[PDB]
């Protein structure tokens, strides 16, 4: 009774805090299932330390929240009460004072330290993963005879370059489709901010994040179906080619869907707004708060990740169980074959979707870690739950999966490598453009001086208000400058500082990654 023990001591909510019998699940399910579960466990282990360091940096930021001079000035009625921000489509900073209280934690030097540590942690991730992979290759004898692969039945049924190009054109067309949907989310925020105003922006951002997550979830299944149909339409000569093409297309689409809103908030929202005179029109691109949209990006990421965890895990629990229930309703002693056939077959893909979910989670954790250090914590929790729920679906709900030989996770590993190659740069960008820490450091080290400071060490504006001078979130020329409402020394200084920081961080982190890869061998000494 291998399955009885495998369900009692594993694949059960009660046994969630027990080690995985990797050898036993290899003997039962197969090599691919075992290596997937081992990879998930190692990912959880690394995210544990990631979360510990993130919580440490978050506590550092929370402790320094009391000494946040800018946030306290925002919340100070003497100065913050006199802030007159220009309209987006004349809200004072007071309504955003509490936001600043939770925003100074988002952009603090502890967050930069954690971003550097996250680069280091991503570096340590892949090397130890491949060391463990070689260890498992030796232990389980994964390296065996790789005989010539049999052609797919649909490929041989009808026995092609133009078709591949048409498939690529359709994939890019659907990429433009989801991009247009995200633009609709931009239109939604513009349309719903006015009614919310009659701070409203916080609820608007939360609702927009919820709507975007729901749209992503809805479109995920639609693209799964259409991509399966398209990949069947094209002809891969082997099943491995089918798997690789489907992996590439699904990864591209899920990357775009999940990270389109995140990239818009990090690198597009509020970047190109100009000045109230001659504002940029498309129409009337979204603006952002003085402290940047790092708060909005953090809210969006937290909402997406938590909703994904909760709702997706509940769905993974129920949908196989719902299908089993509906099969049992179709219609008491029953044999093993009858008991197992009335369960959903896994399919030739299998763990592809769970791998895709974990890769999306890795992208959320690494690509956008400069926003809030608390992403790994919840991610760790997710992984914990994931191990059990997946195991449950592989033991009780679905049938038994045919064993497969898999010395590695497959095309997901190079994808992750590329992800890291992007993620470093992305984090740098988030610290530079998205996070307003660079302007604060620039002020603190170059403008408190007496030469720059004082310390020793249509026209709807008139219709919508009776204010004389409004403060905009830009470094452009204030009134009294010879060329007012235009770029100045401050704006180009800040942009140069951001670009120099990006270059320095990219080069230093890449050098550290190269040093770690060279010093740490890909094969363990014990192995």
**Minimal distance in Å, beta carbon 381 to Ca ion?**
11
Question: Which one of residues 168, 499, 520, 523 is an interface residue with a copy of itself (CB under 8 A)?
Answer: 499
Select from 289, 294, 274, 297 the least CA-distant residue to 92.
289
Residues contributing to the annotated binding site for Ca(2+): 316, 354, 357
Q: After which residues is the chain broken (C to N over 2.5 A)?
A: 89, 159, 198, 282, 331, 457
The region of 119-127, 173-181, 260-268, 502-510 touching a copy of itself under the rule CB under 8 A is 502-510
Q: Which does 474 bind (CB under 5 to 8 A by kind): a copy of itself, Ca ion, none?
A: none
Pick the piece of the chain touching a copy of itself (CB under 8 A) from 221-229, 267-275, 307-315, 493-501: 493-501
Among positive and negative, which fits the CA dihedral 106, 107, 108, 111? positive
**Which of residues 267, 406, 493, 508 is near a copy of itself by CB under 8 A?**
493
Q: Considering only residues 94, 197, 244, 312, which one is a binding residue for Ca ion as defined by CB under 5 A?
A: 312
Residue 503 binding a copy of itself, by CB under 8 A: yes
Nearer to a copy of itself, 203 or 489 (CB): 489
- Beta carbons of 450 and 391 less than 8 angstroms apart: no
Residue 436, binding choice from a copy of itself, Ca ion, none, Cβ under 5 to 8 Å by partner class: none
Residues 368/297, Cβ–Cβ less than 8 Å: yes
- In whole angstroms, how far apart are CA 498 and each of 53, 127, 208? 25, 31, 29
Query: To which residue do tokens 């509020």 refer?
Result: 270
Q: How far is the CB of 483 from a copy of itself (least distance, A)?
A: 6
Hey, which residues between 433 and 472 contact a copy of itself (CB under 8 A)? 451
483 near a copy of itself, rule: CB under 8 A:
yes
Question: What are the backbone dihedrals phi and psi of residue 471, each rounded to the nearest 5 degrees, phi first?
Answer: -95, 125
Helices 161-197 and 239-263: angle between axes, nearest 10 degrees: 20
Terminal CA-to-CA distance of the chain, rounded, Å?
33
Selected binder of Ca ion within 9, 64, 76, 127 (CB under 5 A): 127
Establish if 45 lies at the interface with Ca ion (CB under 5 A). Answer: no
> What is the Cα–Cα distance from 288 to 201, expressed in whole angstroms?
9
31 touches, from a copy of itself, Ca ion, none (C-beta below 5 to 8 Å by class): none
In the complex with a copy of itself, the residue whose CB is nearer, 347 or 418, is: 418
Q: Which is nearer to a copy of itself, 214 or 489 (CB)?
A: 489
DSSP 17: G
> Does the protein bind Ca ion through residue 135 (CB under 5 A)?
no
Pseudo-torsion of CA 479, 483, 486, 491, nearest 10°? -90
Task: Write the interaction track for a copy of itself spanning residues 390-419; mark x where CB under 8 A is met and - where it is not.
Answer: ----------------------------x-
- Write down the residue that tokens 């896994």 correspond to: 346
Number of residues that bind Ca ion (CB under 5 A): 6
The answer to whether the CB of 475 falls within 8 A of the CB of 467 is no
Distance CA 222, CA 250 (A): 11
Burial class from Cβ neighbours inside 10 Å (0-12, 13-18, 19+) for residue 305 reads: buried
Nearer CB in complex with Ca ion: 114/362: 362
Restricted to residues 241-280, the positions that interact with a copy of itself (CB under 8 A) are none
DSSP-derived secondary structure for 155-215 = HHH---HHHHHHHHHHHHHHHHHHHHHHHHHHHHHHHHHHHHH--HHHHHHHHHHHHHHHH
Q: What is the DSSP letter of 265?
A: I
Among all chains, which residue has been given the structure tokens 């740490």?
520
Strands (DSSP E) found in 59-107: none
Taking CB under 8 A as the binding criterion, the range among 168-176, 178-186, 395-403, 483-491 that sits at the site for a copy of itself is 483-491
Least Å from the CB of residue 207 to a copy of itself? 35
Which residue's CB is nearer to a copy of itself, number 470 or number 495?
Answer: 495
Q: Which residues bind a copy of itself (CB under 8 A)?
A: 418, 425, 451, 483, 488-489, 492-493, 495-496, 499-500, 502-503, 506-507, 514
Q: Which residues bind Ca ion (CB under 5 A)?
A: 127, 312, 316, 354, 386, 517
């Amino acid at each position: 009774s291998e399955r009885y023990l495998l369900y009692r001591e594993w694949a059960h909510p009660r046994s969630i805090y027990k080690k995985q019998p990797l050898d036993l699940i290899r003997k039962y399910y197969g090599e691919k299932i075992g290596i997937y579960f081992a990879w998930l466990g190692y990912y959880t282990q690394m995210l544990l330390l990631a979360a510990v360091v993130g919580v440490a940096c978050f506590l550092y930021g929370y402790l320094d929240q009391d000494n946040c001079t800018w946030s306290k000035e925002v919340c100070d009625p003497d100065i913050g009460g006199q802030i007159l921000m220009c309209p987006q489509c004349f809200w004072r900073l007071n309504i955003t004072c509490e936001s600043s209280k939770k925003l100074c934690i988002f952009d603090s030097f502890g967050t930069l330290i954690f971003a550097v540590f996250m680069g280091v942690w991503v570096t340590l991730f892949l090397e130890f993963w491949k060391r463990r992979q070689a260890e498992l290759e030796y232990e389980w004898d994964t390296v065996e005879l790789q005989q010539e692969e049999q052609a797919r039945p649909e490929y041989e049924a009808q026995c092609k370059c133009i078709r591949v190009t048409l498939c690529a054109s359709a994939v890019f067309f659907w990429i433009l489709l989801i991009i247009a949907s995200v633009i609709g989310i931009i239109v939604y925020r513009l349309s719903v901010f006015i009614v919310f105003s009659t701070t409203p922006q916080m609820a608007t951002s939360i609702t927009a994040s919820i709507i975007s997550a729901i749209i992503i979830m809805i479109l995920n299944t639609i693209y799964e179906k259409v991509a399966i149909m398209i990949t069947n339409f094209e002809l891969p000569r082997t099943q491995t080619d089918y798997e690789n093409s489907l992996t590439m297309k699904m990864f591209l689409f899920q990357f775009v869907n999940y990270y389109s809103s995140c990239f818009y908030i990090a690198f597009f929202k509020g970047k190109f707004v100009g000045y109230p005179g001659d504002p940029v029109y498309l129409y009337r691109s979204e603006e952002c708060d003085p402290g940047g949209c790092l708060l909005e990006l953090t809210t969006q990421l937290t909402i997406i990740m938590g909703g994904k965890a909760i709702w997706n895990n509940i769905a993974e629990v129920l949908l196989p169980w719902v299908m089993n229930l509906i099969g049992r309703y179709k219609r008491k002693i029953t044999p093993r074959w009858e008991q197992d056939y009335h369960l959903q077959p896994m399919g030739k893909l299998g763990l592809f979707y769970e791998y895709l979910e974990m890769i999306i989670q890795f992208g959320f954790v690494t690509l956008f870690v400069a926003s809030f250090p608390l992403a790994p914590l919840l991610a760790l929790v997710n992984n914990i739950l994931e191990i059990r729920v997946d195991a449950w679906k592989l033991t009780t709900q679905f049938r038994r999966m045919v064993p497969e030989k898999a010395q590695d996770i497959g095309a997901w590993q190079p994808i992750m490598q590329g992800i890291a190659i992007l993620a470093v740069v992305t984090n740098a960008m988030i610290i530079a453009f998205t996070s307003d820490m660079i302007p604060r450091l620039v002020y603190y080290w170059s403008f408190s001086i007496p030469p720059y400071g004082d310390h020793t060490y249509e026209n709807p504006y008139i219709g919508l208000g009776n204010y004389t001078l409004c403060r905009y979130r830009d470094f452009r020329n204030p009134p009294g400058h010879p060329q007012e409402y235009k770029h100045n020394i401050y704006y180009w200084h800040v942009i140069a500082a951001k670009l120099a920081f990006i270059i320095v961080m990219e080069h230093i982190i890449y050098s550290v990654k190269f040093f770690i890869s060279y010093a740490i061998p890909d094969v363990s000494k014990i192995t």
